[PDB]
Design a protein around this ligand. Sequence first.
Ligand SMILES: *[C@@H]1O[C@H](CO)[C@@H](O)[C@H](O)[C@H]1NC(C)=O
Ligand SMILES: *[C@@H]1O[C@H](CO)[C@@H](O)[C@H](O)[C@H]1NC(C)=O
Lengths: 290, 41, 41
Amino acid sequence: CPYGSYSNGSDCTHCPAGTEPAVGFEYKWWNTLPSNMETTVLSGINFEYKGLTGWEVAGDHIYTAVGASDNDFMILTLVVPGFRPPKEVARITFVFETICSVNCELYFMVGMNSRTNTPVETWKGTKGKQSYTYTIEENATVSFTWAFQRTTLHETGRKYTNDVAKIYSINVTNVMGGVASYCRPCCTSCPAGHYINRDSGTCHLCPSNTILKAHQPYGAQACVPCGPGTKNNKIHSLCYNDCTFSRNTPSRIFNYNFSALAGTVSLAGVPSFTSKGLKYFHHFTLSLCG
Amino acid sequence: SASDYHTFVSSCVAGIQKTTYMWREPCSGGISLPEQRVTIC
Amino acid sequence: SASDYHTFVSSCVAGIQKTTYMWRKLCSGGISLPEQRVTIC
Ligand SMILES: *[C@@H]1O[C@H](CO)[C@@H](O)[C@H](O)[C@H]1NC(C)=O
Ligand SMILES: *[C@@H]1O[C@H](CO)[C@@H](O)[C@H](O)[C@H]1NC(C)=O
């Protein structure tokens, strides 16, 4: 359905002009494989691209198909070219359901700016249906590949086909050149500190000492007041600490100061030796306030 | 606060009194230590 | 010498006195800081 209209599968209705044009990906069913994602097989024995069909659609969920051997990776590569901005360039959420028995790896990898894939998370063993959210630091070309290995150990023959990874729900937020499965409300970006509201009709400012969340645009519900002994920043993105905490006591008022603590310090842990000869030491850079 | 420094004023005996204020042997920053003053009794 | 602390003994007034002994502290050793004592005048 063309962008600006949202469908749930039965009918597509145009997004109202009051709501910003929001394009997002949602694949709850898989009767037709989306054009973005392509399948491939990496043979475990030879570590070469087989070019086979790694994953087979089933109409409701996509699972792992048996290849030359169960050790072969069952890749399913989904690529997005860029991210359309309405920290929230892409909050991708998954529903992985693994009926696999043993040696079950789901190497969900992310390629930031077409770099070499780095495995953000690696699920191991049988796991039930759960939602996993991943955050993209900055806009770039990103590919989500879900490499699957039925068995780590190598055995002749495809004797393990019960190990299947069911992924029946994909949500991608803030995508470029995609369908508008759901349109968020909004149409200009209000200045920092003002919560976007469509029912009010005008840029409305949050109450003082409150921080606004851009994830939930409509209303002041996402706009949360700051905590005790803190001040709101002009951007309202995060609360600020005045470095001076004043509290009341029956005798008098206590005014603890932390002005000299604003600067960062380089304090590291004791040199820690690994199980083997190699040694390390944790170094934490602390910036208290300011 | 102001009332934190220990008061150690001397009273009027033999026509002499001393008013000196200092902090407890166990405050950060704040107003400087007030100096002593002499006055006839 | 112990007495090198500054003596702020409260001169007799209001029917009360304080034998307050407080360090001035470059000194070392000596008898520890003696506390204030109460007696009628
Ligand atoms: C994905 O999750 C976000 C949560 O902020 C939601 O706003 C968005 O509508 C979801 N995607 C779709 C296609 O509904
Ligand atoms: C994100 O980066 C891509 C290049 O990798 C670019 O084509 C796209 O316009 C960018 N998205 C923006 C700037 O919103």
